[PDB]
Design an enzyme around this catalytic site. Structure first.
Site, short mmCIF file in Angstrom:
data_model
loop_
_atom_site.label_atom_id
_atom_site.label_comp_id
_atom_site.label_asym_id
_atom_site.label_seq_id
_atom_site.Cartn_x
_atom_site.Cartn_y
_atom_site.Cartn_z
CE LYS A 168 -0.93 1.22 4.85
NZ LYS A 168 -1.99 2.30 4.73
CE1 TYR A 192 14.27 32.79 1.03
CE2 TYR A 192 14.01 30.40 1.28
CZ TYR A 192 13.98 31.54 0.49
OH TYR A 192 13.66 31.45 -0.84
C1 LIG Z 1 13.85 33.57 -6.85
C2 LIG Z 1 12.50 33.56 -6.21
N1 LIG Z 1 11.64 34.57 -6.43
C3 LIG Z 1 10.43 34.58 -5.87
C4 LIG Z 1 10.01 33.54 -5.04
C5 LIG Z 1 8.64 33.60 -4.45
O1 LIG Z 1 8.72 33.88 -3.04
P1 LIG Z 1 7.44 33.84 -2.15
O2 LIG Z 1 6.49 34.98 -2.68
O3 LIG Z 1 7.79 34.07 -0.72
O4 LIG Z 1 6.53 32.63 -2.32
C6 LIG Z 1 10.89 32.49 -4.79
C7 LIG Z 1 10.48 31.34 -3.94
N2 LIG Z 1 11.32 30.77 -3.07
C8 LIG Z 1 10.89 29.60 -2.32
C9 LIG Z 1 9.74 29.73 -1.32
O5 LIG Z 1 10.09 28.76 -0.33
N3 LIG Z 1 11.43 28.74 -0.21
C10 LIG Z 1 11.95 29.07 -1.38
O6 LIG Z 1 13.12 28.99 -1.66
C11 LIG Z 1 12.14 32.49 -5.41
O7 LIG Z 1 13.02 31.51 -5.22
C1 LIG Z 2 -3.80 -4.48 8.00
C2 LIG Z 2 -2.31 -4.30 7.88
N1 LIG Z 2 -1.52 -5.39 7.82
C3 LIG Z 2 -0.19 -5.26 7.71
C4 LIG Z 2 0.40 -4.00 7.66
C5 LIG Z 2 1.91 -3.92 7.55
O1 LIG Z 2 2.45 -3.22 8.66
P1 LIG Z 2 4.05 -3.12 8.85
O2 LIG Z 2 4.63 -4.51 8.76
O3 LIG Z 2 4.34 -2.53 10.20
O4 LIG Z 2 4.62 -2.25 7.76
C6 LIG Z 2 -0.40 -2.87 7.73
C7 LIG Z 2 0.17 -1.47 7.68
N2 LIG Z 2 0.04 -0.86 9.20
C8 LIG Z 2 0.46 0.51 9.27
C9 LIG Z 2 1.69 1.08 9.46
O5 LIG Z 2 1.56 2.45 9.35
N3 LIG Z 2 0.33 2.86 9.03
C10 LIG Z 2 -0.38 1.72 8.93
O6 LIG Z 2 -1.83 1.65 8.61
C11 LIG Z 2 -1.77 -3.03 7.83
O7 LIG Z 2 -2.56 -1.97 7.90
CL LIG Z 3 -5.58 2.68 5.61
#
Ligand SMILES: Cc1ncc(COP(=O)(O)O)c(/C=[NH+]/[C@@H]2CONC2=O)c1O
Ligand SMILES: Cc1ncc(COP(=O)(O)O)c(C[NH2+]c2conc2O)c1O
Ligand SMILES: [Cl-]
Ligand SMILES: [Ca+2]
Ligand SMILES: [Cl-]
Lengths: 371, 371
Positions: free
Chosen positions: B32, B261
């Site tokens: 899954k 940032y």
């Molecule tokens: C060159 C340049 N110009 C404008 C924007 C737009 O910036 P925002 O308006 O703040 O969404 C970004 C976006 N930078 C992303 C946002 O998350 N972190 C980052 O590095 C950008 O790399």
């Molecule tokens: C009915 C059933 N049988 C086997 C497995 C296998 O689980 P696992 O071996 O731990 O990976 C899962 C998956 N259990 C979950 C782990 O994280 N979110 C879950 O829903 C399951 O829902």
């Molecule tokens: Cl589920």
């Protein structure tokens, strides 16, 4: 659908029109990298351009080629290029390229020779972020190479860009400092005989809160999606465009003293009813939200209880029920109907709404409400 | 730019290890959530080829995708939204696990429309209280199933339940759940209703509580090589997923310069940095910022500064530069080369490796190393 991330394109349009007011005369470059911050680059791009956006901004050429393949013909600029990139397809697709080193320009120039296509170039200069941007010592040699390339019609010198160090702190003097450095870089271009058509420094925060620092273009990203670029000021007249919701998959009674989910991390103090929501952390519901988030069902906040599983978690509905299997639960949205916001999740998780809206996936199918 | 490389030779090894621990029991590989992020179809194919007998998924949709991809082995689905039409499952030879009397009626309605016998498993609640049939409703369910079996409307394949806290295998709740599960089998025997197989065991139970193994085991996490009991070590499994990216930029910086940032990291010394072009929109949890390390050419390099939407910086140190643009940075893997593990990320931000490996996406392209 099991769950959906509904993007309201009328919200997108509204936010673009709000941003254009703050930008005044400067043209708007809507940033739609990262698949439109999880909202869908192509549909958001189309809406924003229809609402007055002049240009589109993305990180990678691959992001720009995706927009071009969807029929977008408006200008698109890409500014993050990995080693080994072939700029050829960008040139053939009329994609604008921002270079951040002499090596990258030389790579672009080889692509111009190979394709016969003049490059529409922007230079990305470092004014403080210290990431991928030409450093101050390297800028004069960059100007020299650009001018020589321009003198042989190998490039059109379109833009000078840089990026702001604070995405949410407009009062901090580093904003003013970066704008002064950008101005001195423009003066350096002048003394080297180089003129750029346009210069831009401003993200969503600078556009909306530091309009005194606006150059020729603004580059809003986060604000286009309706998410506040300075959360301490409120919604800033923007409308978050993404609503994450899912159906109630099961209503289950439990007796006081029974445990829920793995490790039985929550016990029932009273006989009550739980709703199983069939999304979980593989779908982008941060596991750290377990036992802290609330969802809105039929008008009431219902708290999550127990751990978030890979694709499901439980919320407490209380003890007669006004919730039925198949009813809708809202995890976050603009907050119009009283639901949590993306900022609420950011607060619970210790992150920012940028990360929240790029999280929904898997069982959460992206959908659109038209304007 | 980056990849999540799934080593199918590791998958094969892990399946063999799990079959050894399962002894006489057959293995139902749980794929899954798109194979816990490793690719359901490729992992299923590999797991079957290494001797898994059957496949387990949550939804019929997940089962139908396997079928569309050419998988012919048995597939069981155990999470169905209310009002589902089980017709498609029945026509596609998808086994259906029912967790309530109402759900069984939905299935028998679909049997009547399609004319196809359902291969039914009953999912019973032994303490998880998620879904599952309770002891109160199980006698009535047996009475109905006996009546459907008589008319060949259902083949009574399986009884199943799921462990609450098998990653604490010594906890008595495991013994308690197994005893409850036995009580369900006993209730069916005394009512003259026989299941072909019974299965309770996830990865943890399979590897650490073989005394609780019935006819089948249902491992998910261990198939991917991730320890089902982290406190016990790798349990002879090999994590199959390596998340790595190309170094996009190397640069020197001076002491006192801020990075990324908010300048949340200030260089204490002249040093070299590497820009890694993946970020939180690609599944690199933002909360890893300033905590994670990467492996580059055999050396650990700490992340510095905030993790951005699609990139972050790492400190290469002031020693001789031994990294170039184009080199490979490993974010996590099995640990064979000294790289961090998925468990290491889980420790750093307070989650589980399950969530770590269902996170990589975006610029992190899934790739395969053949066995
Ligand atoms: C060159 C340049 N110009 C404008 C924007 C737009 O910036 P925002 O308006 O703040 O969404 C970004 C976006 N930078 C992303 C946002 O998350 N972190 C980052 O590095 C950008 O790399
Ligand atoms: C009915 C059933 N049988 C086997 C497995 C296998 O689980 P696992 O071996 O731990 O990976 C899962 C998956 N259990 C979950 C782990 O994280 N979110 C879950 O829903 C399951 O829902
Ligand atoms: Cl589920
Ligand atoms: Ca190399
Ligand atoms: Cl980027």
């Amino acid at each position: 659908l099991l769950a959906e991330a509904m993007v309201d394109l009328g919200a997108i349009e509204h936010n673009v029109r709000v941003l254009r007011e703050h930008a005044g005369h400067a043209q708007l470059m809507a940033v739609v990298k990262a698949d439109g911050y999880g909202h869908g680059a192509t549909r958001v791009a189309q809406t924003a351009l229809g609402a007055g956006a002049a240009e589109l901004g993305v990180a990678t050429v691959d992001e720009a080629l995706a927009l071009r393949a969807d029929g977008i013909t408006a200008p698109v600029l890409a500014w993050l290029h990995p080693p080994g990139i072939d700029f050829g397809p960008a040139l053939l697709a009329d994609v604008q390229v921002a270079v951040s080193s002499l090596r990258q320009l030389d790579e672009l120039l080889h692509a111009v020779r190979r394709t016969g296509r003049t490059a529409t170039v922007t230079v990305k200069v470092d004014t403080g972020l210290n990431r991928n941007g030409v450093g101050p010592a390297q800028f004069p040699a960059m100007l020299t190479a650009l001018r020589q390339a321009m003198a042989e019609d190998a490039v059109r010198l379109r833009g000078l860009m840089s990026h702001m160090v604070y995405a949410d702190k407009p009062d901090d003097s580093i904003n003013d400092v970066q704008a002064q450095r950008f101005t001195a870089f423009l003066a350096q271009a002048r003394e080297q005989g180089v003129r750029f058509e346009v210069a831009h420094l401003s993200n969503s925060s600078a556009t909306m809160a530091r309009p005194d620092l606006t150059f020729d273009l603004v580059r809003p990203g986060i604000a286009v999606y309706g998410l506040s670029p300075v959360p301490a000021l409120g919604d800033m007249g923007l409308v978050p465009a993404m609503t994450v919701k899912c159906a109630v998959a099961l209503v289950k009674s439990i007796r006081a003293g029974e445990g829920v989910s793995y490790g039985h991390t929550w016990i029932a103090p009273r006989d009550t009813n739980l709703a199983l929501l069939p999304i979980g952390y593989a779908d982008g519901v941060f596991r750290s939200l377990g036992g802290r988030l609330e969802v809105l069902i039929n008008g009431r906040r219902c708290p999550g209880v127990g751990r978030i599983c890979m694709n499901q978690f439980m919320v407490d509905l209380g003890p007669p029920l006004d919730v039925a299997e198949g009813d809708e639960a809202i995890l976050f949205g603009p907050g119009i109907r009283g639901e949590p916001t993306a900022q609420d999740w950011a607060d619970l998780v210790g992150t920012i709404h940028y990360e929240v809206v790029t999280s929904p996936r898997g069982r959460i199918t992206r959908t659109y409400r038209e304007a």
